[PDB]
Symmetry: D2
Subunit: 388 residues, 4 copies
Amino acid sequence: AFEVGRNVAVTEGAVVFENEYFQLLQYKPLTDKVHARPLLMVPPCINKYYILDLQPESSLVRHVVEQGHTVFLVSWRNPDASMAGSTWDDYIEHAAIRAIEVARDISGQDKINVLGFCVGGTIVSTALAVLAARGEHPAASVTLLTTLLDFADTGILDVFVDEGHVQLREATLGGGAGAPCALLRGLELANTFSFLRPNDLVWNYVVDNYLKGNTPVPFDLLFWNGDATNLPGPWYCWYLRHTYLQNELKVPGKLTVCGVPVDLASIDVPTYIYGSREDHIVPWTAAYASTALLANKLRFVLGASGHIAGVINPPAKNKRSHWTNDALPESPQQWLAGAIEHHGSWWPDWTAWLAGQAGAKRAAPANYGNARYRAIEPAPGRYVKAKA
Amino acid sequence: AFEVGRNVAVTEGAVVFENEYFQLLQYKPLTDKVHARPLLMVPPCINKYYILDLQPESSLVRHVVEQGHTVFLVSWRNPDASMAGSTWDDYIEHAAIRAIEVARDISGQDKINVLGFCVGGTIVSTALAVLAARGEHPAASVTLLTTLLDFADTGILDVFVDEGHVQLREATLGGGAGAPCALLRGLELANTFSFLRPNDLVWNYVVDNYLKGNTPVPFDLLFWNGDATNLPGPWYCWYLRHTYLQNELKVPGKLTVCGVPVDLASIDVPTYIYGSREDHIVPWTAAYASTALLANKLRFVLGASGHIAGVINPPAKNKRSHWTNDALPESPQQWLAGAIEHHGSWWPDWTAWLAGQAGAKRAAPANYGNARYRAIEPAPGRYVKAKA
Amino acid sequence: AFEVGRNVAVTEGAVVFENEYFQLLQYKPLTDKVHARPLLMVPPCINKYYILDLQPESSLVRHVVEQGHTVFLVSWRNPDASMAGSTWDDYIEHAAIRAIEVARDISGQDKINVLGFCVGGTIVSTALAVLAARGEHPAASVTLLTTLLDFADTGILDVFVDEGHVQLREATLGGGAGAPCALLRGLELANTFSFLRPNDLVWNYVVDNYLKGNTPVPFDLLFWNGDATNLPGPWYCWYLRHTYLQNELKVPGKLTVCGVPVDLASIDVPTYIYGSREDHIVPWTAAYASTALLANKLRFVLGASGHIAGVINPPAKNKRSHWTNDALPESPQQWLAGAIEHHGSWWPDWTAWLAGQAGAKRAAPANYGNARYRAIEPAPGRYVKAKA
Amino acid sequence: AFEVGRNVAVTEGAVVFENEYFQLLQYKPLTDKVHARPLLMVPPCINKYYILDLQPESSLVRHVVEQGHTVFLVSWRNPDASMAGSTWDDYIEHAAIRAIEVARDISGQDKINVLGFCVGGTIVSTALAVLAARGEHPAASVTLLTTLLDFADTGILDVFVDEGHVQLREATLGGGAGAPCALLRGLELANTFSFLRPNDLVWNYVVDNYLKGNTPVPFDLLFWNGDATNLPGPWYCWYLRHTYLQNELKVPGKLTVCGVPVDLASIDVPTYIYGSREDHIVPWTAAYASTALLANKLRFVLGASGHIAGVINPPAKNKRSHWTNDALPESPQQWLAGAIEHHGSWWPDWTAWLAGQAGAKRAAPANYGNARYRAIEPAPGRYVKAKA
């Protein structure tokens, strides 16, 4: 039976910082030397971080640590009633930008590597764009795994498109500015698989039972997906309105966040973009659309299989395949037509790229954090253990 | 501002029967003569019946009444805490089969015409199959508007299909019988547009605001769609499990309902099947799949436009078009390739077909119901006014 | 029985110019006054021009003439053995650019309006971009009906995408420059409906017979589609290679044509872009992609129905509908979500826009052409009568 | 450089029978013992048989021979001017039924195993249905690799569906019986990849060059695909009309072939059905539709990848994966939802199934054929060497 901290999320480490929003974990080195620049991972806040450190055999964290990188990770607070009014901006400032600042401080480096996964990627991208408009450039590189930046054709609009009346007269839309997200208060249950689907006792019961008895969806995934998290009402409103519905984050300067316009092209650092071919949560062609929005040197890699199966594919198992193509045409079909299929995991491709941005190796740290930020408790930390 | 009984659902009539489950409405004639056989309409219980009698200009009820048919309609109870354990079977027996029995009794006819809309169609079809296995045949004809019988490719499965591990060994599924629907208790909020989507304060707020300001979705539709209904937990479990997930109602004899196996081919009466081309709630090709399951003489008609716009298209407005094809090949694309597009509403095509199954005209009734079932209160009735 | 010049392509006019490549037609006015700026129409060279002047009731030419515009039209030569080496560039220089020069000369105007249909649109766009790199700006406005500029996802690539080997090693593509189009010589039969499909005696026989007996595809369309044209081998090679396969015309400066790089954004004039919703030859979302490539004020309109049915929809018949939306988001689904459906033909919307770019009305000309270019023979001309 | 009989199609064997239509090859055993029942392979006549014996490393023939089965194979004649009037029936009687009779005669067995690939599968299925209506049952089992029986949604219809006029009146289709296939005479070039696409000098030149320089489509595939075959005009007409266009072979009794109605359910033998997931020539869901038409015990297996890459995946290379599911629901998506992904080639799954239908092992034959049918020349034979 799965248990966080006993047989799931067991990579050794410590919490080195915490605030209302999150706990920053730092993992124990597993090598004698490590790269100068550490990697900060920003996982999604829809479901918990541990999908990235699921079990020892399948852990991305462990794998990266074993390649000689110092890893820091944002373990999100499962929000309580005091955070029922927390906003998208609050998370960007007090968690994403904060985590970057703390990791950079502990590392002693001018620049760190950053990774985002799913909504984590959208969060980290936004945070870095906010930072760039402030004239700050704390990232050497960005890795976006299964991240949506351009939300075109995610399908939430579809059932409404053919409901308009046939007009015999000049007609105009309503055109109003929406009721502000700040007028809501609440905690709404969320999970990854059913994020755009019902979340109610009956649906959760019927679906969970059907999957277990009629499909080979793995138990570890069902465990993680079932360990729900609460989303603050204004946060959830903002995300739904400005990405899925209005698709504005990809329009340079359209949105204002934490006092500045968000222009994704302003992040401007080497960026590794990943998608999974059979992913219906983040269509691979939607992840690919990030290539049209970001500056600097980009690499796109496509992994075989599903949303979780494609991303969590450790090389030791020698399973699946991935595709690479150095050229980045506008159209994903054109990208694929030119791509070469390679056996196995895409992890080695990424860690090779990451090594290139991480500087020279030096002796590994013996302790966690620094004088300012000392160890608080062992990873995985108590925040990840909180029920929604 | 919309108000049920003041400017919506105003076709004149009376409640002639009521029980815990529903109120049966009977409409006042608008012609001197009417067909011998009346039509009973079974609307969906997801949202309220009035989408079928929306406003005088757009009312299907009014239109049918004006063609000389006596119309009875099932106005569903918005379930309360006493009905938090009501089942799919309870609804079939105590509402659908009951409504048929009461309408037949009042009419004095051996057979009546029946119409189902959306989930109403699935309900009425099930009820009639149950009746046929009991050796009872109360319907002269069936009309299925925007009804799913075969739920293949409705897409709820999609995000889970590519999550299985790659096996190097013989492997088998879990294969268990599911936890019974009867173990749940509850009332879950439901609406048509978001039935397979979230239903929560934030989603409802964000979506409603976005539609109003950025799309031409009509206000009358948004009113109806926003007037939610509660679904009993076991009912909701059954529907989700046996149709959308396991797609078993279309497998003859697979499901047992109200003590008998359900075989759709056992309904065996002339049947008019309708779908709307741009409908993403009930794909037209899914409605078309009913043609492969039902016996007797079938007609399929395809209306232009969306889920509501295509079905609620009164002929007076002279808008849109529909397609007809007497041949019924297995494949819907083959059906369409041979179909002729006709100007305007499909309503006249249907009412012409309906006239053919409804017998000879005779003088209209002066009063509602009969000695056994007298008028209780005026339509639209108090049940439809209850908030969820 | 259809016959070009007897009951098809009968709008009154004259050939005022001819060369190896085409005949320029000028139509007789049907109004006392006409706009200062005439419209030159460049139809496709795949099949013949007359789809635009099909029959009096269905003629776009006649309709535009009746709104008070002087219309000139390019009637393409059905190439003979002497033209088996004609190139894409030859057509741009000797036909498209030539037609513009002759129409401008006859009109006496500094600028003319231009329309392209299907491949005609791709041709005229290219010609105008070539002209703009030469510093010439002969067009006041451009109308692109059912035109592909960005050829992404037209599907010719699809059957080849999943044929690569799985590599266990670093691998690279072949990467070679293609064998030049100029090495081919030939005349290849072409038609619109089967342009990406077989064109052989058996296919043409089987398809034509099946359509006539099992579908409502109209006889006038089948006549036009069956009246094939020959494509010079190098022309056909260029078109297939640089648009459908490599999709390079949309990459600013990528292609060199008639000595200059082609940059579509350099046309820079008000542009009206049209697509038909159920068009599978030119997907409406592909026509919509033109909005991302062109400068100046753009309007996009979407007509209901098929490739020919949607475009050839004269207002007198009062059939179908079209959609308008002044906003031009990047994604076509977002455009549609905000669009208002309007009854009937889109023609009046376009001719209203066209009136705005065509200047003041003045008395209609009494004669064809001018001293330099006098009438040669009556429209439709002998070129359009030549068999392939 | 590829050459048939030198480094392609080199599995050792002999031609043991020939007629105007084909040469029957028999392969030399590579084991001391072989199953009692041999396997006859019927490859497509669109392109040549050798895709099934491509190179020693990638040969399906060699692999099956190495598992202990006697293999016979139909090597089709590349038709000449004398065969420009050959019909679908001629091929069924004089090649498919003939090959079965000759293989059965040489083997001395009451029943043989049969395999069809692509159009070969459609041919062999038809032949066996013809045989069953004659009361003959020469097959112990059937293997259908990448075979279309139900041709629904292959897309040839699509561009014509939305061209009908809007009718304000009762309207009817043309409804005529088609001009007979027997009125055509000719030899039409065909290849697998472009079977539903142009086949002309320019297309073949442009596509071949583009694939070589911009994609990883393998050279061996391009060689095979480029080695075209001629199709007799009536044969081609029949195939196109009755499968792709009218989809009649799947309607029991609809078509008459070689004097008898064709009912696929009459074949009635254990059948192994295979499809490739990313195949756009034979969609895997179209191959899956065979499960609804055939009697007896069926197995469906889905291989990963493309049309050729998925089927030609030898186990030694240890690449890709395949899916299995013993249950056969009507819907392919439901089949997939329950399927288990297995590492590597599907070949071992099939040869294990085939062993089960092939009887007891006995000593391998020392010679080819029998007294009636002796060796004529060495495999691959001269027929396969003929240019179109």
